[PDB]
Design an enzyme around this catalytic site. Structure first.
Site, mmCIF file in Angstrom:
data_model
loop_
_atom_site.group_PDB
_atom_site.id
_atom_site.type_symbol
_atom_site.label_atom_id
_atom_site.label_comp_id
_atom_site.label_asym_id
_atom_site.label_seq_id
_atom_site.Cartn_x
_atom_site.Cartn_y
_atom_site.Cartn_z
ATOM 1 N N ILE A 80 0.861 6.714 0.187
ATOM 2 C CA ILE A 80 0.516 5.884 1.060
ATOM 3 C C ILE A 80 -1.100 5.698 0.794
ATOM 4 O O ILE A 80 -1.544 6.692 0.742
ATOM 5 C CB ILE A 80 0.474 6.161 2.501
ATOM 6 C CG1 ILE A 80 1.985 6.631 3.008
ATOM 7 C CG2 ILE A 80 -0.146 5.063 3.548
ATOM 8 C CD1 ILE A 80 2.247 7.373 4.220
ATOM 9 N N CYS A 81 -1.521 4.461 0.484
ATOM 10 C CA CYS A 81 -3.054 4.147 0.467
ATOM 11 C C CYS A 81 -3.568 4.011 1.634
ATOM 12 O O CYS A 81 -3.321 2.628 2.142
ATOM 13 C CB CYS A 81 -3.260 3.204 -0.434
ATOM 14 S SG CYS A 81 -4.854 2.792 -1.109
ATOM 15 N N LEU A 82 -4.315 5.057 2.409
ATOM 16 C CA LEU A 82 -4.780 4.781 3.840
ATOM 17 C C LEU A 82 -5.999 5.665 3.675
ATOM 18 O O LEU A 82 -5.904 7.002 3.433
ATOM 19 C CB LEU A 82 -3.920 5.290 4.675
ATOM 20 C CG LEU A 82 -4.198 5.136 6.168
ATOM 21 C CD1 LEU A 82 -4.458 3.834 6.581
ATOM 22 C CD2 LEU A 82 -3.387 6.033 7.302
ATOM 23 N N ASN B 234 0.827 -1.263 -0.139
ATOM 24 C CA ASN B 234 0.012 0.071 -0.066
ATOM 25 C C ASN B 234 0.779 1.248 0.004
ATOM 26 O O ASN B 234 0.194 2.391 0.058
ATOM 27 C CB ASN B 234 -0.893 0.105 1.338
ATOM 28 C CG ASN B 234 -1.773 -1.190 1.464
ATOM 29 O OD1 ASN B 234 -1.571 -1.910 2.586
ATOM 30 N ND2 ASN B 234 -2.614 -1.369 0.581
#
Ligand SMILES: [Cl-]
Length: 149
Positions: free
Chosen positions: A86-88, A79
Site C-alpha cells: 500500500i502506498c500511503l 496505490n
C-alpha cells in the site's frame, strides 16, 4: 519491548470501545504483534459490498516506527499492488507515534475512496483512474465481485 506491548493493548481496547464504522482489527490468535484487519468497501465507491482483509505487523519499537500493513484481498486501485503493498505516506516517511491502527484504517478507507495521484504503484490503473473514471469504476466493481465477496 514492554512499551510497544502496552501501546498495542491500549489500541486494541480503543477499537473495541469505539468500534469503527466498517473496519475491524486485532491479533490473529495470541500474537499481539501480528494482527488482521478488515475494511468494508465504502458505500458509494466501486468497492461497495466487498470485504477486504489486511495483515498488520507491529515492530518492537512501536509506536515510534510504523506498523507494516498489507492487503491480502486483491483490489483494483492505483496505490495498492498485486502483492497487497500500500502506498500511503503515513506508513513510511510520514509516520508519527500519534498515529494508531484506527487512524491508519480510516486513512486507507479514505484512500480507497480517493486515490493519490502522485503515487501510482500500479501505473496502468492510475492511468485509467485519471483518463476514464467510468471505466475505472466498472473494472473496480468487477474485481470487487470477483475477489472481495
Ligand atoms: Cl501508550
Amino acid at each position: 519491548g514492554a512499551m510497544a506491548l502496552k501501546r498495542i493493548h491500549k489500541e486494541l481496547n480503543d477499537l473495541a470501545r469505539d468500534p469503527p464504522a466498517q473496519c475491524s482489527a486485532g491479533p490473529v490468535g495470541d500474537d499481539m504483534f501480528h494482527w488482521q484487519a478488515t475494511i468494508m468497501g465504502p458505500n458509494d465507491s466501486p468497492y461497495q459490498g466487498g470485504v477486504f482483509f489486511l495483515t498488520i505487523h507491529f515492530p518492537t519499537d512501536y509506536p515510534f516506527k510504523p506498523p507494516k500493513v498489507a492487503f491480502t484481498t486483491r483490489i483494483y486501485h492505483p496505490n495498492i499492488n498485486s502483492n497487497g503493498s500500500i502506498c500511503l505516506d503515513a506508513l513510511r516517511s510520514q509516520w508519527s507515534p500519534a498515529l494508531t491502527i484506527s487512524k491508519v484504517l480510516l486513512s486507507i478507507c479514505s484512500l480507497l475512496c480517493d486515490p493519490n495521484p502522485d503515487d501510482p504503484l500500479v501505473p496502468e490503473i492510475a492511468r485509467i483512474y485519471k483518463t476514464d473514471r467510468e471505466k475505472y469504476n466498472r473494472i473496480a466493481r468487477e474485481w470487487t465481485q470477483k475477489y472481495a465477496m
